[PDB]
Design a protein around this nucleic acid. Structure first.
Ligand SMILES: [Zn+2]
Ligand SMILES: [Zn+2]
Ligand SMILES: [Zn+2]
Lengths: 1101, 65, 48
DNA sequence: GGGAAGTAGTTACGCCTGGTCATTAC
DNA sequence: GTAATGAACTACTTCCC
RNA sequence: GACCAGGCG
């Protein structure tokens, strides 16, 4: 037989062979191999206005990753070099152009059209296939999984958008009317079109088309595509007698009123109202051609197929009305497809190439018109080569990848990579985001779904408004690529399916769909689906094909596109799983791998469609004859960070969510090459440790090699108030011995920029004469070349690099001091100094500062069970209680926090950790398979202690034992990066905004806090008017304004003769002074900017 | 990075007996008997050796000069 | 103003002046990245 | 006239981190 | 070298056959 | 200075 401990061996090979970032690398490889060629072949060629010239496109190739120096040479590039020098890791692109003269092709030529960024560790990157020591020699961490870009020295990652199905038909119903709306999205060359057909109280079918405001009737739009005879419409749509009667009711609006061209006249009248009569026909024909179901083609010949598809949509609409089909569910995962890098990059490349071809056309036309035909035909190769500007492609791709604003209005496609530690980066590389708007409630979209089982982690999600709309992939999830569709269609046509054109559907015949479109009918689909799936199991066809059927409507669905999310399962036949013990043995030895298991037919992938027909058993001892599949490992449905929590089934869901989210913030050894690596911020834990109680998944995924957190001796006891309300108490001697000690990094950058002309910057110790020269104390440890010596102490406002800018035009002959200095509220020691050259010849220096941080009051500590707090008091060792066996607690936690949160897993982990430490072996706590509690309690009883986990302690001050036994154990704890040293802030006086003369904003620039409106309301509610006057006016902008009393305008004061007079009216005696806030003066000025005139009436006192 | 010199909780010196424990546990001995032989009675000290990672050896490959 | 520098990947000393040098490259390696070596001064550090 | 139907207006408060801009053809 | 721009809600207001 | 993305209560 097979026990759950055996399936773990098989499950390990999946991660050992495939990895964790497959959905990026596979998609990018598919894009590289085929996407570029398809995009190039879409355009065809260039048609300039030259009388006898035309260019045809050939092949496209991608070169090696290289960089070109400004002086001309081109040399190889490596990722660390690109990161340090703030360059872009890209490779050149080559294209073949075939000149055509007078209709005869010439010999081809090859030109470079630009550069393309390269995904790290892809099939074309320089790091592909290298060994561990090769990566070590190159400065890379072998644990790095890859799958991100390097843009201008920064690391960018592309998240996956959760779009809707690309060609399916979805029906629904709204309550504001009786409309039975069926809407589809049609995709062709990146263009999205929305088409809807529906009925209403009139009973007449109506159609909505983009760029057509009026909902033209159904028969009118059908007759525009031909088949005017009334028999043709009914034959096209359906054959049910009730449907026949409904259609006879529908026809009378257009059956004997219009013909094929008359409907064209109506459409032309609507699309072009009041325009030229001939204009209307062409406009209507254009709209019909390339705005109605574009995915069926834009040629005028495809109108019959378009009419058939529209008739099918209308048939679905009317079938909803009679209650022959339940309404579709939008949140069901069979209706949603993911967007990966290979398609977003395809769209971006498409738009960039579309710009480039037009630019080339313009350049060629202008050059030929100016120079003349003799120059163009003298050397055609040179004429083609020198007319290409390869920057419009590179710059447009790079800017879009850098900013993150995709063409088409989408935002947030590209994000900065989170490099706090291992778990943060690994979880960030597996994100899934929704395109909905954040502010709206979206009650239906944020809820969990039954189809999410095995495809989406149910516990890892943000906490704010982003809850529900951002999710993470599960561990068993597998994304799919796309296979060619023509081969699949011609294979499907060869086993009994008749074409749709030859035979009309009828209620006794099954329907067959391929990727959402109808292709034919068959007399028996129950045998067809079995044959197709058996062929897939045998190995005749690819495994990306999934087949499902619904007998209520007599339909069969076949899917072969990319973007689906699938999970693996074990095939069960005749109540016996197909996996045997010898298979597990062969996998363990190494003779058999996961791919071979897939090929042999033991394990198959199921998407959301096939799972409708399945009946999955959970445990190997629960299978019977009815079951069709066996679950591999239930513990793997959780995401990556959510799998760290030991005994996750003993806690409340919000606490598990808090722990999973908080596991991405703890300090620890992130990557091995942190010393060389240049980052804006960084952290390091001095003595990381492996958790004593852990899940077996973390060992497999490599978490044990980059841990984060330490084990504490925790006693659950109520101390003297200082640990109340989620506060913790820490021992002092433990801190003095290295517990929870960490270091903080920060990098500064300076550049010797070049200006317009001979003006330039310079690295130099500033002279006392130059403007803005700081005190000579600050330039204390700068070497004469202008750079600071390493390993020298620095305080706030100290200068790291001395730079003198050219003089600012009004000050002549006076250089400006623009040195780079440490932040005003930081402190540390210089660690390393790097000198290098940028991509255009300018010098560049980078300096890092190292600071040591010891725990103090306010620092945030948190376990992995969702319990968080801050240090309340630090206690000397001799004051802490001690157990009668010789143990002194390392941490104290209030017992009031346990019952409300109901985190029993923390107590379980404490008992297990103490038992593991006593026994000298780690304890397994992997979800539903870990060691049971009673076994741990019995083992603890055997080892000599008490089964309840309690002990006897003595008071550390009085010196006598307490009246109650105290729970005590060992618990894993983590230190978050929200330290108090980065939050303290105070302001008395400082810089102000230029426009409003109010204090600036932000801790970084000595800003001030904001006194919001509810604070004003609170002050009003107390009744302190003078406090309001002081806070809102005295400590903010305040000014004196001269006001003309006779006319109400603001007077003018002249410094040249100390005379004050009103400009609009000649008044010089009634001028008075008023005290008001500057912001109100700006408001008065802005009101006077418009034609509104505010008049002021003064009063005494 | 490297083995701590002293146990955090009680200050006992355990920094010189990690390699012997690792070698004798890699030689197939019973970990509990090895820890008892080394003289570590309180589990606050056994926690130090039982859960340590030697991360020093795989970070010396990167030199900063 | 002559100062000592060390190559990023070879570690061997490179001697040049930053004021007038137009390109930064180790004469031994194609690399353009250089370090600034630590001075020879007895830095004093507390043991807390 | 009193039924559409099509505008027009809103959707909690702080704080922190980092990254990008701010034209071009001749 | 520079001159040149390229999703929900709710209550009103307007129809309207 | 304005935008974008991610976090904290
Ligand atoms: Zn006046
Ligand atoms: Zn100890
Ligand atoms: Zn060198």
């Amino acid at each position: 037989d097979v026990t759950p401990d055996d399936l773990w061996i098989v499950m390990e090979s999946y991660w050992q062979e495939k990895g964790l970032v497959r959905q990026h690398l596979d998609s990018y490889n598919a894009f590289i191999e085929r996407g570029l060629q398809e995009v190039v072949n879409e355009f065809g060629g260039i048609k300039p206005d030259i009388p006898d010239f035309e260019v045809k496109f050939g092949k496209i190739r991608v070169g090696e990753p290289e960089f070109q120096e400004p002086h001309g040479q081109r040399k190889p590039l490596y990722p660390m070099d690109a990161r340090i020098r703030n360059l872009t890791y890209a490779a050149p692109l080559y294209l073949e152009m075939i000149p055509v003269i007078k209709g005869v092709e010439q010999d081809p030529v090859e030109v470079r059209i630009g550069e393309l960024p390269i995904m790290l560790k892809s099939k074309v990157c320089r790091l592909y296939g290298l060994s561990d020591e090769e990566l070590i020699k190159l400065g890379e961490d072998p644990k790095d999984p890859g799958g991100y870009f390097i843009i201008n020295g920064s690391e960018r990652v592309i998240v996956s958008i959760e779009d809707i199905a690309p060609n399916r038909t979805l029906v629904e119903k709204d309550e504001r009317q009786e409309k039975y709306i069926a809407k589809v999205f049609s995709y062709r060359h990146g263009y999205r079109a929305l088409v809807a057909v529906e009925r209403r109280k009139d009973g007449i079918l109506y159609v909505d088309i983009p760029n057509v405001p009026k909902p033209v009737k159904f028969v009118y739009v059908m007759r525009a595509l031909g088949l005017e005879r009334d028999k043709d419409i009914v034959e096209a749509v359906g054959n049910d007698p009730e449907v026949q009667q409904i259609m006879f009711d529908n026809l009378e609006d257009a059956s004997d009123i219009t013909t094929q061209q008359e409907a064209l006249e109506f459409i032309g009248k609507l699309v072009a109202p009041g325009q030229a009569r001939e204009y209307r026909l062409k406009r209507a024909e254009y709209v019909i051609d390339n705005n109605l179901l574009p995915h069926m083609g834009v040629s005028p010949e495809d109108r019959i197929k378009k009419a058939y598809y529209l008739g099918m949509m209308a048939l679905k609409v009317i079938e909803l009305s009679l209650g022959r089909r339940p309404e579709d569910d939008k949140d069901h995962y069979a209706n949603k497809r993911l967007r990966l890098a290979g398609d977003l990059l395809k769209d971006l490349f498409r738009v960039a190439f579309s710009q480039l071809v037009k630019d080339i056309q313009y350049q060629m036309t202008k050059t030929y018109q100016r120079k003349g035909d003799k120059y163009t035909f003298g050397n055609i190769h040179r004429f083609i080569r020198n007319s290409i500007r390869p920057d419009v492609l590179t710059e447009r791709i790079e800017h879009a990848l850098a900013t993150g604003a995709w063409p088409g209005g989408r935002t947030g496609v590209s994000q900065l990579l989170d490099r706090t530690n291992y778990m943060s980066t690994l979880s960030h590389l597996r994100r899934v985001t929704s395109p909905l708007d954040r502010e709206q409630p979206h009650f239906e979209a944020r809820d969990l779904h039954g189809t999410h089982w095995g495809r989406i982690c149910p516990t890892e999600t943000p906490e704010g408004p982003n809850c529900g709309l951002v999710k993470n992939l599960a561990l068993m999830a597998q994304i799919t690529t796309a296979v060619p569709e023509e081969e699949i269609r011609e294979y499907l046509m060869s086993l009994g399916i008749v074409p749709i054109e030859v035979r009309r559907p009828d209620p006794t015949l099954w329907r067959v769909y391929l990727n959402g479109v109808l292709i034919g009918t068959i007399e028996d689909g129950k045998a067809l689906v079995q044959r197709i799936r058996q062929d897939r199991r045998s190995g005749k066809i690819s495994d990306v094909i999934n087949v499902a059927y619904y007998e209520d409507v007599k339909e069969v669905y076949v899917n072969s596109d990319d973007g689906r999310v699938r999970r693996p399962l074990i095939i069960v036949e005749n109540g016996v799983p197909k996996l045997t013990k010898e298979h597990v043995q062969a996998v363990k030895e190494g003779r058999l791998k996961w791919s071979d298991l897939i090929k042999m037919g033991i394990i198959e992938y199921l998407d959301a469609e096939e799972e409708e027909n399945a009946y999955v058993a959970m445990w190997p001892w629960e299978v019977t004859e009815e079951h069709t599949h066996l679950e591999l490992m239930p513990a793997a449905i959780l995401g990556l960070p959510a799998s760290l929590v030991p005994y996750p089934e003993h806690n409340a869901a919000p606490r598990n969510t808090y722990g999973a989210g908080m596991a991405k913030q703890s300090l620890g050894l992130g990557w091995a090459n942190f010393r060389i690596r240049v980052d804006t911020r960084g952290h390091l834990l001095h003595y990381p440790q492996i958790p004593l109680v852990n899940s077996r998944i973390m060992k497999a995924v490599g978490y044990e090699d980059r841990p984060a957190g330490q084990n504490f001796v925790v006693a659950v006891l109520a101390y003297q108030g200082y640990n109340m309300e989620d506060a913790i108490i820490i021992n002092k001697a433990s801190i003095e011995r290295g517990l929870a000690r960490s270091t903080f990094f920060r990098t500064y950058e300076a550049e010797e920029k070049k200006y317009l002309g001979g003006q330039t910057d310079k690295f130099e110790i500033p002279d006392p004469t130059v403007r803005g020269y700081r005190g000579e104390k600050y330039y204390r440890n700068l070497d004469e070349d202008g750079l600071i010596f390493p390993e020298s102490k620095v305080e706030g406002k100290d200068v790291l690099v001395g730079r003198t800018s050219p003089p600012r035009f009004l000050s002549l002959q006076e250089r400006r001091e623009t040195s780079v200095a440490v932040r005003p509220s930081e402190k540390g020691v210089v660690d390393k100094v790097i000198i290098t050259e940028t991509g255009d010849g300018t010098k560049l220096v980078k300096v890092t500062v190292r600071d040591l941080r010891i725990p103090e009051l306010g620092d945030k500590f948190a376990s992995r069970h969702g319990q968080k707090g801050v240090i309340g008091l630090i206690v000397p060792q001799e004051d802490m209680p001690w157990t009668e066996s010789g143990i002194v607690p390392d941490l104290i936690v209030n017992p009031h926090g346990i019952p409300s949160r109901m985190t029993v897993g923390q107590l379980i982990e404490a008992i297990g950790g103490k038992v593991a430490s006593l026994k000298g072996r780690r304890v397994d706590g992997t979800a539903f398979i870990g060691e049971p509690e009673e076994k741990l309690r019995k083992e603890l009883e055997e080892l000599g202690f008490k089964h309840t986990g309690r002990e006897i302690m003595y008071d550390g001050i009085t010196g006598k034992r307490l009246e109650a036994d105290i729970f005590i154990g060992v618990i894993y704890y983590q230190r978050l990066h929200h330290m108090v040293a980065d939050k303290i802030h105070a302001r008395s006086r400082g810089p102000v905004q230029v426009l409003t003369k109010q204090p600036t904003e932000g801790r970084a620039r000595e800003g001030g806090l904001r006194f919001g409106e509810m604070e004003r309301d609170v002050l009003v509610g107390h009744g302190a008017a003078m406090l309001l006057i002081e806070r809102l006016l005295e400590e903010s902008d305040k000014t004196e304004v001269w006001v003309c009393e006779n006319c109400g305008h603001i007077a003018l004061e002249d410094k040249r003769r100390r005379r004050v007079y009103c400009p609009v009216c000649g008044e010089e005696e009634r001028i008075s002074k008023v005290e008001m806030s500057y912001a109100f003066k700006l408001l008065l000025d802005e009101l006077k900017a418009m034609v509104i005139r505010p008049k002021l009436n003064l009063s005494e006192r | 990075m490297i083995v701590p010199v002293r146990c955090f909780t009680c200050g006992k010196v355990i920094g010189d007996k990690y390699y012997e424990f690792k070698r004798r546990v890699e030689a197939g001995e019973d970990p509990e008997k090895v820890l008892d032989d080394l003289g570590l009675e309180r589990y606050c000290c056994r926690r130090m050796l039982l859960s340590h990672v030697e991360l020093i050896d795989d970070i010396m490959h990167y030199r900063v000069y | 103003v002559e100062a000592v520098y060390r190559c990023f990947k070879c570690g061997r000393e490179v001697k040049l002046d930053l004021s007038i040098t137009r390109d930064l490259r180790c004469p031994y390696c194609g690399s353009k990245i250089l370090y600034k070596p630590r001075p020879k001064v007895p830095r004093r550090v507390k043991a807390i």
